Symmetry: C4
Subunit: 208 residues, 4 copies
């Protein structure tokens, strides 16, 4: 767990994210918990020119390394880390289906049993606030109190997990759920959902 290994995974996460179709051109930022703060992708530099030494260290006070410009969205990555002590990785993208659901300002309800991967019977949608602001950061910290993923109204998605592998995986799963919801919603509104008792069985089963 040296710095450069963590920077290679961050870069590999951006690459896989783009290959999975979740990341569409210069949007998206990834981070990992490290020392007293985090390592995050830089602003500006396109994913394919990224090299290990581009990765930026931001400490717990919010100070970033000299000569590097962290992602313009770094503050809600730090919000995530202080609101969810168990989170070690944070993935953010503007994936098209998640973002369309966030434009309608709706939570994703329990239309599939995999909704439980993010911790409960829904994928919440946090209210709009300008990117990079303290106000956005507060909404995200409140939405992640009992969920590992949230939509951001008029914006995109955030997912957090114990490592980058699982955070990408979750991010991906919520984009599938989002696409499932939009496709069925164009046909029938509201969309049929599983009951809370049924999601409670599935959560228990996922613990086992």
């Amino acid at each position: 767990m040296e710095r450069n290994k963590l920077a290679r995974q961050i870069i590999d996460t951006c690459l896989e994210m783009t290959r999975l179709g979740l990341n569409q051109g210069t949007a998206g930022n990834v981070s990992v918990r490290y020392q007293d703060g985090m390592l995050i992708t830089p602003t500006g530099i396109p994913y394919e020119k990224l090299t290990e030494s581009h990765i930026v260290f931001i400490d717990g006070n919010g100070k970033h390394e000299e000569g590097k410009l962290p992602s313009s969205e770094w503050r809600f990555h730090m919000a995530a880390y202080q609101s969810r002590p168990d989170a070690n990785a944070v993935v953010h993208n503007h994936a098209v289906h998640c973002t369309a659901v966030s434009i309608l300002n709706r939570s994703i309800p329990a239309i599939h049993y995999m909704i439980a991967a993010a911790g409960g019977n829904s994928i919440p949608c946090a209210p709009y606030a300008t990117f990079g602001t303290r106000e956005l950061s507060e909404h995200v910290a409140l939405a992640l109190k009992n969920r590992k993923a949230t939509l951001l109204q008029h914006h995109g998605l955030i997912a957090c997990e114990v490592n980058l592998e699982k955070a990408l995986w979750l991010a991906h799963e919520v984009e599938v759920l989002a696409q499932l919801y939009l496709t069925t919603l164009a046909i029938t509104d509201p969309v049929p959902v599983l009951s809370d008792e049924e999601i409670a069985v599935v959560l228990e089963k996922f613990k086992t």
Copy 2:
């Protein structure tokens, strides 16, 4: 027909399934009939780290090999094998269009002549029951009595055939039919279908 050749095809089936866009992140399990039970993919291990010796043998009594954890959905693979003696391979995924049709709880009717590939004038949708349960297993065995593919409400798809090649192929065909149905359904409901006499000509023709 040694064990390792069957395990390479299983792994190759997961890979092709993901490349075809039918398998979206850690969902999906494949099996083949073998000896008195079956070889199935393990739970946990991501498709790309899979190696031949990861494949799990489950006998006819439901006992799995020592030190391996079979897919969490193995029971409906075994249900398939006892309900359809002619089936030698079973493919299961959560492909997005099939699953959206299963959220609406509808069968796919005869909107295209290829519906006959699964044996009749429809692609049925079996009722929801918690993954991995005996109750799910019974619904699947009843849906496969006269069809080689079925949707699973709020969940996904199962397809069975004489070998893995044909099972993947069928799985793929039902995802196309699913997408055809959802796209036309957003425009007109109900969707125009071919009559039963016409599907009966096509079945005879497919036998020849």
Copy 3:
């Protein structure tokens, strides 16, 4: 213009067709005009196991080479060649958007100026008839009298041109037009179209 060069292009056309997303699993057949009949893809054999010597020669009387089984849809390829003397290549697939428009039994009207690539102000839809029958063949020959592409109700698409390159290209263009029509149709019906005078200017311009 020896046989094997024509068979490599046919095979290359199947490959490109699959890579472009127009051909989804074992559907689709391609042919070229040759001598007194045509070279067509065989039935059964999956596109990726195809080799030059798999290609089947069918003469002008409809007799096929010994030991080879031509595509199950060969008769409407021969219909195309006798109905359009200028056609030297024929491409058929079940591409998802074209086929969805053919399930609604509608022609594609002039929603984009590229509709003129197939010769007029529309992409017609020929009535359903069982695959491989004389009756299907007659509908296709009548739809291609003044168009180079047609939809086949409840089935798919046929496109013909002076060579395989242009036939694939046209096929592709009609799948785009199909997707344009379905996406706008879910929002507004009817969809705005360009007038016949405007398509007449574009045709003249395309001749120049």
Copy 4:
């Protein structure tokens, strides 16, 4: 900044455009500002057979190099350059979502904060006029007066920027916004938007 380096990027831009799914078969043309006119892709030649010496130089008077046929849509590339002095690269495609929005003849409103990348609170739609005409050229020059991207009714998209990298990037971003708008529009009309004050904060923030 020699000619051949500029021709390699143009060709690389066509390739990336096709790989990103924005360019579907022989549509699309790219240009860069050069000397007193521009370098543009030729008409006819498919993107994959393009070589550096295929690139056509058109001077400020509209005269093209000897023995080369410039794109059939070159005139609105020249319109762009005279209407926006800061533009050094121009990308045009018929990307499916942008074009579907242009068939409905609607501007893309502020459904996402990234709408500000093209300079304001919208992505305008310029009125139809036959491809390659002076009349089309005038509409494009008026739509680009205060925007870096515009839709073309019944046709496609144009994007301009300081270099090819940024022009492709913008083009891509507008196709995402287009897809966001069509997907939400099928569910609710009108689609929720951010207010002008909010886009004004985002523009200021994007300047910083």
